Specification:
Keywords: Cell membrane, Disulfide bond, G-protein coupled receptor, Glycoprotein, Membrane, Receptor, Transducer, Transmembrane, Transmembrane helix, Ubl conjugation. This protein has about 375 residues and is an all-alpha fold. It is built from 14 helices and two strands, in the order ααβααααβαααααααα. The chain has a two-stranded antiparallel ribbon with strand order 1-2. The structure holds cholesterol (3 copies), the ligand CCn1c(=O)c2c(nc(/C=C/c3ccc(OC)c(OC)c3)n2C)n(CC)c1=O, (2S)-2,3-dihydroxypropyl (9Z)-octadec-9-enoate (OLB) (2 copies), (2R)-2,3-dihydroxypropyl (9Z)-octadec-9-enoate (2 copies), oleic acid (8 copies) and sodium ion.
Length: about 375
């Protein structure tokens, strides 16, 4: 068929994706810029990622449309057209890894997270990540390209001038770079690191929930022990275990009452006043129902929240992988199997369109899983 027809379908889909990418990610940026409840370190990496997607629509997709035509161009200019999307993809990877690490710090060490992770260092990290993304993505421009061995015939058939080439991705970008350097080292390794980080996150959260329920169970079971005890030494056993568990749970003003009441009962148990020690320990039920239950519930709620936020971040990371892996896998076949027939052109553009689609989904994930983003989107739209 006349190449323009299939091209028209590919171009039309690309432009539609560009519109949606720009609109959605501009909305994310606007939401963070207005709402102070969304202005944190985590959402600063979210904005860095949104900027990458905005640039995908404004530059990467136009570049992709351009390089699909095979227009005559200087090989190094064609190279920039081809590799700029690699810059944006690498920036996305760094932002995703930063979010994963930020969440891990938030749950692993909630105490020092406020001082360890701050917005100033975050801005510096984002800057560095963009510089390294330009370095990685544009590494072919430094010499790892196929400009030294142009396809002279394909340049003459299209009437390209002296020093020009038919600007085609696989003609100028080496495939060993895309497979070994870009995919394996710069895409797959970071993603597997993110996987390990999120496993540590969820493992931690599960362990802390188990610790909370364990401390609640021990506090009630030793209460039963104190009830049915028969001598002062046994009451002392249960209470000593209690006191340690109390100063323990305090770490991860009502507790003051608790530990104090344990001390009262423990002193009276040391005086051989068994009976009055169970009464003094039975006072603990009051402190538990009014103070230790509320703490258990509030803490469990906060950890469930951290799990939810981590799940949202992992969803976006996984969607990034889902959208980009097909193109990388096609490159692996093009590189590792020269005996295989190259992936058909329609499948190539389907994979490119999918990678680009990734720049549209993140705003939707925010709106469907994060209430603050959802409500801010609503306010912006209604106005
Ligand atoms: C800040 C933003 C808006 C600036 C964007 C500038 C972009 C579009 C510019 C910067 C460098 C430019 C390229 C430089 C050299 C060549 C080789 C030539 O044979 C064809 C055009 C081509 C491939 C240019 C296309 C346009 C280009 C990519
Ligand atoms: C999916 C995540 C976990 C890891 C990525 C796995 C990738 C690197 C794997 C999955 C399937 C693999 C391909 C399966 C089959 C072939 C055909 C063979 O003649 C050359 C190697 C090649 C082309 C493999 C290269 C590596 C490959 C693309
Ligand atoms: C869900 C994501 C992560 C994985 C998707 C895997 C996709 C990209 C895989 C599944 C089957 C694969 C195809 C299987 C066979 C061939 C024929 C060969 O001559 C060229 C490559 C080509 C056309 C492969 C391209 C990549 C392919 C389409
Ligand atoms: C690094 C991410 N990536 C890619 O990895 C990539 C790609 N285009 C191709 C390949 C395009 C292509 C391959 C064979 C063709 O003809 C046989 C062809 O003709 C238009 C285009 N590849 C491998 N693009 C879009 C510019 C891309 O972004
Ligand atoms: C070339 C550069 C062009 C860049 C285009 C897209 C970037 C737009 C996004 C950059 C602005 C982000 C912003 O202000 O929101 C977050 C802050 O409020 C946090 O305090
Ligand atoms: C995820 C874990 C990492 C996976 C990377 C596996 C890459 C393995 C890819 C090797 C393919 C290969 O060498 O094929 C043989 C041909 O070249 C001979 O003709
Ligand atoms: C070509 C490079 C394009 C854009 C630069 C990336 C823009 C990234 C915008 C992120 C802004 C951000 O997160 O700001 C942090 C904040 O200032 C801390 O207090
Ligand atoms: C901040 C927002 C600003 C918006 C910025 C707009 C986005 C860039 C658009 C297109 C770049 C790709 C188009 C490059 C086409 C080159 C065609 C050309 O030069 O053709 C000559 C021919 O090949 C003889 O050799
Ligand atoms: C999400 C969008 C789903 C639909 C994707 C359709 C995109 C591309 C398939 C069109 C392929 C036609 C061949 C292009 C001809 C050419 O320019 O060489
Ligand atoms: C993906 C697309 C979501 C677009 C949402 C529509 C509102 C856009 C308004 C804006 O650009 O600020
Ligand atoms: C194309 C690129 C456009 C990016 C859009 C990003 C919009 C978000 C933040 C930029 C700052 C907005 C400046 C106007 C502030 C108005 C006010 O606060 O009264
Ligand atoms: C945000 C949506 C994007 C809108 C911007 C317009 C898209 C531009 C894309 C491609 C322009 C084609 C450039 C001309 C290449 C030379 C063609 C040739 O000589 O064969
Ligand atoms: C900012 C908006 C800039 C818009 C640029 C978009 C497309 C430029 C395409 C130029 C194509 C002319 C090539 C002519 C030819 O060599 O046949
Ligand atoms: C690490 C981050 C720093 C990366 C930037 C520093 C140096 C790269 C300079 C490359 C010069 C490009 C010219 C190549 C050419 O035109 O052949
Ligand atoms: C190829 C490995 C893909 C890793 C995806 C990371 C998403 C986190 C999920 C848990
Ligand atoms: C529907 C979207 C595409 C789904 C699966 C892609 C599988 C690849 C099959 C094409 C093989 C081409 C060939 O060898 O002739
Ligand atoms: Na992205």
């Amino acid at each position: 068929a006349p190449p323009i027809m299939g091209s028209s379908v590919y171009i039309t889909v690309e432009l539609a994706i560009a519109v949606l990418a720009i609109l959605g990610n501009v909305l994310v940026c606007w939401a963070v810029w207005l709402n102070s409840n969304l202005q944190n370190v985590t959402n600063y990496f979210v904005v860095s990622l949104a900027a990458a997607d905005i640039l995908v629509g404004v530059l990467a997709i136009p570049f992709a449309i351009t390089i699909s035509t095979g227009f005559c161009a200087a090989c190094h200019g064609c190279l920039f057209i081809a590799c700029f999307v690699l810059v944006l993809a690498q920036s996305s990877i760094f932002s995703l890894l930063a979010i994963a690490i930020d969440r891990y710090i938030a749950i692993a060490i909630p105490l020092r997270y406020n001082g360890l992770v701050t917005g100033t260092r975050a801005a510096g990290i984002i800057a560095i990540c963009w510089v390294l993304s330009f370095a990685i993505g544009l590494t072919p421009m430094l010499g790892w390209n196929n400009c030294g061995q142009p396809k002279e015939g394909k340049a003459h058939s299209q009437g390209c001038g002296e020093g020009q080439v038919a600007c085609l991705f696989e003609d100028v970008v080496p495939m060993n770079y895309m497979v070994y350097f870009n995919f394996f080292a710069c895409v797959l390794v970071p993603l597997l690191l993110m996987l390990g980080v999120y496993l540590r996150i969820f493992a931690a959260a599960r362990r802390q929930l188990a610790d909370l329920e364990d401390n609640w169970e021990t506090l009630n079971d030793n209460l039963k022990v104190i009830e049915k005890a028969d001598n002062a030494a046994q009451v002392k056993d249960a209470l000593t275990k209690m006191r340690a568990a109390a100063l323990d749970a305090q770490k991860a003003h009502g507790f003051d009452i608790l530990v104090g009441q344990i001390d009262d009962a423990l002193k009276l148990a040391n005086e051989g006043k068994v009976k009055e020690a169970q009464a003094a320990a039975e006072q603990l039920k009051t402190t538990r129902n009014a103070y230790i239950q509320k703490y258990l519930e509030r803490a469990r709620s906060t950890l469930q929240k951290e799990v939810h936020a981590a799940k949202s971040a992992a969803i976006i990371a996984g969607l990034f992988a889902l959208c980009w892996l097909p193109l990388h896998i096609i490159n692996c076949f093009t590189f590792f199997c020269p005996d295989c027939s190259h992936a058909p052109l329609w499948l190539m553009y389907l994979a490119i369109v999918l990678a680009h689609t990734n720049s549209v989904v993140n705003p939707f994930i925010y709106a469907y899983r994060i209430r603050e983003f959802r409500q801010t989107f609503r306010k912006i739209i209604r106005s």
